[PDB]
Amino acid sequence: DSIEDKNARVIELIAAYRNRGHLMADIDPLRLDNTRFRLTLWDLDREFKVDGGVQRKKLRDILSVLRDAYCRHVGVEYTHILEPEQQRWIQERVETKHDKPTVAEQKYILSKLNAAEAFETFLQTKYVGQKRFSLEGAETVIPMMDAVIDQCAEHGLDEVVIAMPHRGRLNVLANIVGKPYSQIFSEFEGNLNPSQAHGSGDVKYHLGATGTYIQMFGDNDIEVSLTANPSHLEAVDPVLEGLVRAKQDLLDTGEEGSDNRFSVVPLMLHGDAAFAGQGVVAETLNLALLRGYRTGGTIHIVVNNQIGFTTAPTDSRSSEYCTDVAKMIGAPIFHVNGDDPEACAWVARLAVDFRQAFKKDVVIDMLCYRRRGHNEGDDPSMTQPYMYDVIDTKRGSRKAYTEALIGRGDISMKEAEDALRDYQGQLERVFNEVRELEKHEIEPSESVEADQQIPLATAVDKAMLQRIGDAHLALPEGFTVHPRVRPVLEKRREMAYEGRIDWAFAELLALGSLIAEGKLVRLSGQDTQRGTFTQRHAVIVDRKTGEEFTPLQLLATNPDGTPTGGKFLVYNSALSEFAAVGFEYGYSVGNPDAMVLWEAQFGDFVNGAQSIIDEFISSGEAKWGQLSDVVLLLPHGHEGQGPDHTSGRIERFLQLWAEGSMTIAMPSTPANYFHLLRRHGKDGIQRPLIVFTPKSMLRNKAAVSDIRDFTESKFRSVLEEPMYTDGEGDRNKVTRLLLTSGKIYYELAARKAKENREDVAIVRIEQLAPLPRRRLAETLDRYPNVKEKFWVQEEPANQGAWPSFGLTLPEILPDHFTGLKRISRRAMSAPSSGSSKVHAVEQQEILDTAFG
């Protein structure tokens, strides 16, 4: 009504654009949604109060600033950000006049759209019947990624690490990372050399590459990497993060680094349907600001072609944008029109600037379209006739941008034509040279087992064990240890000097000795600092102040004061399995010289990371030549705590095992666990280790080891009873042999002692995979009067080691294992019964059968 009323209506209008302007922005190059674009006129020329300091601006000028910033080809979502300094930063860079690119920069963008579109048309011409998951309709991704990388080089960063799905993957490999065209062309020809034909392999749009990006207008260079992935969309997201964090830790940058540059940048590409539908996206975003996982912000690019094969976005998500999940971490989101390559390159540079300023994730939603079917052989008008009727009228971004550069007089029609002829002439020359190569004979894929051959002294000095023991009592000045934590630290110093070392200390003796030798040790998982079973105490919390103390971190310094090079990185993970296991797998790939251990609360929850186990951990070497030394610690054992607190599903890991891809163990003694970890960290082999770890056996007084087992011994794949190797036991009295693995040994041994059964022997198989054939055959030959052999296990008949051992043992060793029978629980649907009482009755039946 009045001046005070009018000025208040302007402030509401200013906030509506900043909050909701993106809903009116011309971001969709297809204009599919018809209803998208659903105070007096005398007040437009009046001057209003604006806090920008405070200045007086005409309503028309305020309005035009808001429309240009928020309602053109860029939809900006940032008012959900809780940090006011971040809202101010974006608001200042978005609500100002943007400097137009130079003619040279515009021409360079055009060259990126030329290379992008002519690569996809050349492939449509030469290999019309092969899938390539074309980037056609989304060519703007290439100048956009180029701008991200160029802006990272402009900030003087060290590396950009990419992860992406199928969409434009080959295009990115060739035009961004620098994968030779000849290599891509040789893949389509299906003529691979012995190096490319190694292992079982994988499809062309799953492969990675490395290279050096050189600035076109600047004087800096930056490393560009692209990591391998399975078909399983978004599964590589935590793997990328782990890989980057491992690289950042090595360059002394980021969270565990001297500077706060986070000089290794994750550039993560996504499809619009997969970004909203896959849970691992939220799991990986949730890691973005965590101390144990932060990479200083990820640059996310969503190639939003408004389709998921035949599925419309309406059936893909319950939200306006495919990127709305990124709001959970307060990430700014830029929705940009794919037909405006200049707006796309500008948003990409703004994204990198935001990441560098706040060490936080940024999401770019590139609205585009998919010119062809889902694959190049699919007909999309069957399911999307309206969308494909609009695409057929649509001139590509390259043709449109070419017509803009000719209009602006920047280039001629001849220069534009000649540049396309040059590019297609170059591809034809390389395609012909590749086709001219002599064709190799196709042979069946071969096992990778022999690609990595085992050398190994894992025994340490008594002074080493004592130093790790002393570290547990080398408390900072005035530190107050919790009264129930103090006996663990004192009992460990006692263990290190007097023996009877339990499982929990043997683990820290292994990790501590590696740190002392200069190894980087990364240990993480749910409540891993203290330990689920209050056993580890890798970090101790001051009772009065809350201050933390990490005893093994003292092993990173030599007694002469110099560093060993080693480090202890121990964290409490978020409540995730998929992202946490993926991250640790990626971390080991990123730093092959690191000791990387991930611990499940109980092995029963590792099935939440099944895609990582199946697609990365068990098969990555055979498929991509990608090596990982990740350790999975899986608390396992029948103790009456129910079907979810019992099994790490040993049978599933043994089923997945082939070609010596992983080591699978279930050690029964602390010393054997110690040597297993040291062998894994020192063998020079990069292969995952699956360890089935104890729960109650952690506090079993029989399950302790002598100092000489650490100082003058090595890993034992097969273990005999101490009464035969160190005692006065007679092996020739044995008629029944019991073959087992894990904690059930101690129960069988206690029953043997109670009944003085000299006729029965118990042999433990510590290394489940690869089977210790030679050592097992030698061991059995030491018992010549054996008339019957039984595989004994607490696990149901369809679980544990029996499904694989019952088939493999009589086949690999027919002389020793023909007639081998099973003693176990019945086959069960669940890993165990829900009642502790019923567990006890079943457990006693097993030992009665084994001795009856």
Ligand X SMILES: Cc1ncc(C[n+]2c([C@H](O)CCCC(=O)O)sc(CCOP(=O)(O)OP(=O)(O)O)c2C)c(N)n1
Given 303, 325, 703, 768, the residue binding a copy of itself (CB under 8 A): 325
Q: Please say whether the dihedral angle defined by the alpha carbons of residues 125, 393, 25 and 109, taken in this order, is positive or negative.
A: positive
Q: Is 532 annotated as a binding residue?
A: no
543 binds a copy of itself (CB under 8 A): yes
Given 534, 535, 557, 564, the residue binding a copy of itself (CB under 8 A): 534
Closest to 351 measured CA to CA, from 141, 90, 176, 161: 90
Residue span binding a copy of itself (CB under 8 A) among the ranges 61-69, 339-347, 651-659, 744-752:
651-659
Residue 231 interacts with, from Ca ion, Mg ion, ligand X, none (CB under 5-8 Å by kind): ligand X
Residue 678 interacts with, from Mg ion, ligand X, a copy of itself, none (CB under 5-8 Å by kind): none
Q: Which CB atom, from 256 or from 683, has the smaller least distance to Ca ion?
A: 683
The distance in angstroms from the start CA to the end CA of the chain is 99
**Radius of gyration of the CA atoms of the chain, in A:** 32
Q: Which CB atom, from 271 or from 637, has the smaller least distance to Mg ion?
A: 271
Q: Taking the CA of residue 723 as centre, how many other CA atoms within 13 Å lie in the half-sphere pointing to its CB?
A: 18
754 binds a copy of itself (CB under 8 A): no
**Per-residue contact flags (x/-) with a copy of itself for residues 263 to 302, judged by CB under 8 A:** ----------xx-xxxxxxxx-xxxxxxxx-x--------
How many residues are present in the chain? 852
CB of 249 to ligand X, least distance (A): 26
φ/ψ of residue 161, rounded to 5: -110, 120
551 binds Mg ion (CB under 5 A): no
Q: Is 289 annotated as a binding residue?
A: no
Please calculate the CA angle 503-667-850 and round it to the nearest 5 degrees: 115
29 binds a copy of itself (CB under 8 A): no
Please calculate the CA angle 245-246-250 and round it to the nearest 5 degrees: 110
Q: Which CB atom, from 114 or from 278, has the smaller least distance to ligand X?
A: 278
CB of 626 to ligand X, least distance (A): 16
Given 456, 575, 750, 830, the residue binding ligand X (CB under 6 A): 575
Residue span binding ligand X (CB under 6 A) among the ranges 270-278, 389-397, 427-435, 452-460:
270-278
624 binds ligand X (CB under 6 A): no
Q: Which CB atom, from 589 or from 685, has the smaller least distance to Ca ion?
A: 685
Q: Is 714 annotated as a binding residue?
A: yes
Q: Give CA–CA dist 371/141, Å, rounded.
A: 14
274 binds ligand X (CB under 6 A): yes
Q: Are 632 and 689 in contact (CB under 8 A)?
A: yes
Residue nearest to ligand X (CB): 271
Given 48, 571, 605, 805, the residue binding ligand X (CB under 6 A): 605
CB of 245 to ligand X, least distance (A): 22
Q: Give CA–CA dist 96/99, Å, rounded.
A: 9
Q: Is 536 annotated as a binding residue?
A: no
Residue 652 interacts with, from ligand X, a copy of itself, Mg ion, none (CB under 5-8 Å by kind): a copy of itself
Residue 547 interacts with, from Ca ion, Mg ion, ligand X, none (CB under 5-8 Å by kind): none
CB of 769 to a copy of itself, least distance (A): 11
Residue span binding ligand X (CB under 6 A) among the ranges 35-43, 425-433, 600-608, 754-762:
600-608
Binding site for Ca ion (CB under 5 A): 629, 680, 683, 685
484 binds a copy of itself (CB under 8 A): yes
Q: Are 512 and 471 in contact (CB under 8 A)?
A: yes
CA 415 to the chain's CA centroid? 46
Instruction: Report the 3 state secondary structure along 494-561.
Output: HHHHHCCECHHHHHHHHHHHHHHCCCEEEEEECCCCCCCCCCCCCCEECCCCCCEECHHHHHHECCCC
Cis before residue 770, ω within 30 degrees of 0? Answer: yes
Q: Please say whether the dihedral angle defined by the alpha carbons of residues 778, 783, 789 and 791, taken in this order, is positive or negative.
A: negative
Q: Which CB atom, from 717 or from 804, has the smaller least distance to a copy of itself?
A: 804
3-state DSSP helix/strand/coil % of the chain, to nearest 5? 45, 15, 40
Q: Which CB atom, from 295 or from 316, has the smaller least distance to ligand X?
A: 316
Closest to 791 measured CA to CA, from 728, 832, 745: 745
Given 444, 478, 727, 814, the residue binding a copy of itself (CB under 8 A): 444
Given 106, 175, 305, 804, the residue binding ligand X (CB under 6 A): 305
Q: Give CA–CA dist 464/71, Å, rounded.
A: 67
Given 241, 255, 584, 621, the residue binding a copy of itself (CB under 8 A): 621
Closest to 567 measured CA to CA, from 584, 550, 580: 550
CB of 303 to a copy of itself, least distance (A): 14
Q: Is 683 annotated as a binding residue?
A: no
Q: Which of residues 290-329 bind Mg ion (CB under 5 A)?
A: 305, 307
CB of 274 to a copy of itself, least distance (A): 5
Q: Is 429 annotated as a binding residue?
A: no
* Dihedral over alpha carbons 451, 659, 611, 602 (to 10 degrees): -110
Q: What is each CA distance from 669 to 362, 636, 650, 688, 806, in whole angstroms?
A: 48, 14, 18, 21, 25
Closest to 285 measured CA to CA, from 298, 274, 273, 302: 298
CB of 313 to ligand X, least distance (A): 9
Q: Taking the CA of residue 213 as centre, how many other CA atoms within 13 Å lie in the half-sphere pointing to its CB?
A: 32
Q: Which CB atom, from 302 or from 515, has the smaller least distance to Mg ion?
A: 302
**Per-residue contact flags (x/-) with a copy of itself for residues 218 to 257, judged by CB under 8 A:** ------------xxxx------------------------
Token pair 């919390």 is found at 541
Q: What is each CA distance from 586 to 236, 554, 579, 592, 681, in whole angstroms?
A: 9, 27, 10, 10, 17
CB of 836 to ligand X, least distance (A): 13
Q: Are 631 and 606 in contact (CB under 8 A)?
A: no
* Dihedral over alpha carbons 258, 264, 270, 274 (to 10 degrees): -40
Q: Give CA–CA dist 796/838, Å, rounded.
A: 14
The structure tokens listed for 92 are: 């200042």
The structure tokens listed for 305 are: 């072609």
Q: Give CA–CA dist 69/636, Å, rounded.
A: 57
Q: Give CA–CA dist 198/624, Å, rounded.
A: 9
Q: Is 214 annotated as a binding residue?
A: no
Given 233, 504, 768, 809, the residue binding ligand X (CB under 6 A): 233
576 binds Mg ion (CB under 5 A): no
Q: Which CB atom, from 490 or from 683, has the smaller least distance to Ca ion?
A: 683
741 binds ligand X (CB under 6 A): no
CB of 239 to ligand X, least distance (A): 14
Given 320, 417, 422, 428, the residue binding a copy of itself (CB under 8 A): 320
Given 307, 350, 363, 368, the residue binding ligand X (CB under 6 A): 307
Q: Are 629 and 616 in contact (CB under 8 A)?
A: no
CB of 323 to a copy of itself, least distance (A): 9
Q: Which of residues 576-595 bind a copy of itself (CB under 8 A)?
A: 576, 578-579
Q: Which residues are annotated as a binding site?
A: 167, 206, 231, 233, 272-274, 305, 307, 645, 663, 679, 714, 717, 767, 774-775
**What is the contact surface with Mg ion in residues (CB under 5 A)?**
271-272, 305, 307
**What is the contact surface with ligand X in residues (CB under 6 A)?**
133, 166-167, 203, 205, 231-233, 271-274, 278, 303, 305, 307-309, 370, 374, 526, 575, 601, 605, 608, 644-645
Q: Which residues are annotated as a binding site for 2-oxoglutarate?
A: 206, 231, 645
